[PDB]
Design a protein around this ligand. Structure first.
Ligand SMILES: N[C@@H](CCC(=O)O)C(=O)O
Ligand SMILES: N[C@@H](CCC(=O)O)C(=O)O
Lengths: 252, 252
């Protein structure tokens, strides 16, 4: 009581193997780095109390982990919060308190410039019956199946940037994919590093955001929402974005 | 107990005198109409329990009411929820539980096409020292003063579409304004009905959204966030948007 001090916050962080500028492991303390970590730390700093905290990596380090499962670790009280590129989707809001979003997100279709005549957006992709690439561990798999009625066998999980590019280059008739469905923040990074061979086709066809996932009725969730809005209004969210993400490439 | 039935939810609704397609009074029940009302009703319908509810108009019907005060009526327990075009801003999240946003929003600068050389965005507007138009009752007044360091005397409240157009047309040297600062959803409607005389200049320089404001720790807020995300993922949010807002005009 008098002798025994406070537990620290147990923060689950996805062990990303792709798009590591958003969030990834660090060899140095605090053991994690990236856009999402700097936003979380900047928001903590704005709180009117200290928040003793430890970061714990979630995932085998081979494939991006299940973000559905990361959030359920918060629900099961194995983490106090999940911090990272965590998409706010219906099934995840049921059991946790997400903050207000700290960045806007939504799904886009990426295809070769050559293929843009036949695959011109999500609707033409649905009807084509050709393979669709997605990241490991994304909500996008169950969104495509349940919302857009895609035959599960069509959805091909891809491990990293090499497999995203490789699958798009090989195409649907040579053990690749007709398109990748992923969130715009990841695709903005992919098109910076893919030499203008690939583009978005059609409209961004979902809209949501990334948020921090706290346990139901967490007072910390409420204050961190206020902090995030403060970061946004002060222009700090854009400053942190500019530090981690430049979207300018050699063919633009 | 056995005889006495449930209170209905007391829903505060802003009595808008401009941009009435977003939310406004109705001569017929339930006494309110608009985009924000249809989103709220569609979200209620998705809940796994009934929500007996009454809508109460907030504002004198002459000027748009203080949205800061509408939210504080929820805090003070005079309303159970505030429903309408309610911007999620730091000072409002302190005491209420906003839903996840049901539409994205942010501030833009509107100026005459002629004036676009001198007023080219928020930064040039700040330094110009000329009058700035805003709606009655908007968060944007205190955002401009506290965040962008605008002398309060420069901020000119305008009553309705007639005064928005009139003030922009008269300009800063004839009892008008150099520009209007307002949220993009309202400006999208203004530029549809202003004959291509006016345009946005520079980047959208804030990002947030509209949400429904529930009392702190409202379980209804949690379920309505899930419902809103469901509406978004099913494409119902866009269907309701298309019913109330068309942005196509005769010079486009
Ligand atoms: N942001 C995605 C995770 C992306 C991935 O699968 O690596 C989600 O929350 O589902
Ligand atoms: N959406 C604005 C209100 C606009 C108005 O002033 O009419 C707010 O929440 O502050």
């Amino acid at each position: 009581g008098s002798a025994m001090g406070s537990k620290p916050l147990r923060i689950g962080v996805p062990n990303r193997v792709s798009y590591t500028d958003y969030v990834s492991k660090d060899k140095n303390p605090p053991g994690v780095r990236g856009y999402c970590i700097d936003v979380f730390e900047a928001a903590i700093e704005l709180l009117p109390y200290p928040v003793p905290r430890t970061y714990i990596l979630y995932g085998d380090g081979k494939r991006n982990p299940s973000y559905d499962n990361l959030v359920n670790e918060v629900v099961a009280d194995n983490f106090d919060v999940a911090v990272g590129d965590i998409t706010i989707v219906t099934n995840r809001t049921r059991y946790v308190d997400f903050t207000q979003p700290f960045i806007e997100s939504g799904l886009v279709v990426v295809a070769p410039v050559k293929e843009a005549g036949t695959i011109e957006g999500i609707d033409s992709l649905v009807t084509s019956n050709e393979p669709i690439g997605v990241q490991d561990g994304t909500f996008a798999r169950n969104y495509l199946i349940n919302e857009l009625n895609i035959l599960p066998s069509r959805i091909v999980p891809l491990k990293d940037e090499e497999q995203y590019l490789s699958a798009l280059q090989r195409g649907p008739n040579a053990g690749g994919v007709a398109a990748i469905v992923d969130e715009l923040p990841y695709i903005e990074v992919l098109l910076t590093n893919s030499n203008c061979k690939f583009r978005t086709v059609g409209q961004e066809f979902t809209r949501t955001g990334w948020g921090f996932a706290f346990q139901r009725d967490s007072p910390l969730a409420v204050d961190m929402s206020t902090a995030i809005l403060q970061l946004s209004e002060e222009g700090e969210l854009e400053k942190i974005h500019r530090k981690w993400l430049n979207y300018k490439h050699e063919c633009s």
